[PDB]
Design a protein around this ligand. Structure first.
Ligand SMILES: [Cl-]
Length: 190
């Protein structure tokens, strides 16, 4: 592949680039850059709570480390802070969806909150119906544009529909078992 868009995001991010180059080439497309916290698990969050969590993360960023790691079939409640370019695809998480991720925008205190909501989530190895929701959030205009809250939680009984990997997104099952890929921590601000 060529790396023009990636390279745009690793300008001036040397530590994160160095950590990625330590990973075998085949797995570099598979890893998430996730914060070493961990966030307590939570049910579906109100919008003001999301805004606060991302504001606090932006203010704490020089004291928070990240690692490149695989994420696979996280339990309901799982909350991650992740670094991702809005123009690159998300790495795999082991979740498939029977519908398209929908994109909503909310004005909050003169800022934009992006909500990317993927209902009808399922784990094809263990589920014949949809049981999960994934939300990716980010808050624009506060100097934290490339940082996301990613939330996995329980779907409603009313939203559960028959699931089949043959018509789901993504269409391809990931290779199991997963290799051991977790880098030692690095910083994204100094
Ligand atoms: Cl749809």
């Amino acid at each position: 592949h060529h790396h023009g868009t990636e390279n745009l995001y690793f300008q001036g991010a040397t530590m994160a680039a160095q950590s990625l180059l330590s990973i075998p080439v085949e797995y570099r497309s598979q890893v998430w850059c996730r914060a070493n916290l961990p966030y307590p698990p939570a049910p579906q969050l109100p919008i003001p709570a999301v805004v606060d969590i991302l504001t606090k993360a932006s203010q704490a960023l020089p004291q928070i480390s990240f690692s490149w790691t695989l994420i696979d079939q996280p339990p309901d409640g799982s909350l991650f802070l992740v670094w991702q370019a809005p123009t690159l695809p998300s790495p795999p998480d082991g979740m498939h969806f029977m519908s398209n991720e929908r994109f909503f925008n909310m004005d909050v205190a003169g800022k934009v909150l992006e909500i990317h909501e993927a209902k009808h989530g399922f784990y094809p190895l263990s589920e014949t119906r949809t049981m999960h929701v994934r939300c990716r959030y980010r808050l624009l205009g506060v100097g934290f544009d490339n940082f996301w809250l990613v939330h996995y939680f329980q779907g409603s009984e009313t939203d559960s529909i028959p699931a089949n990997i043959s018509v789901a997104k993504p269409p391809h099952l990931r290779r199991y078992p997963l290799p051991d890929v977790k880098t030692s921590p690095f910083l994204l601000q100094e």
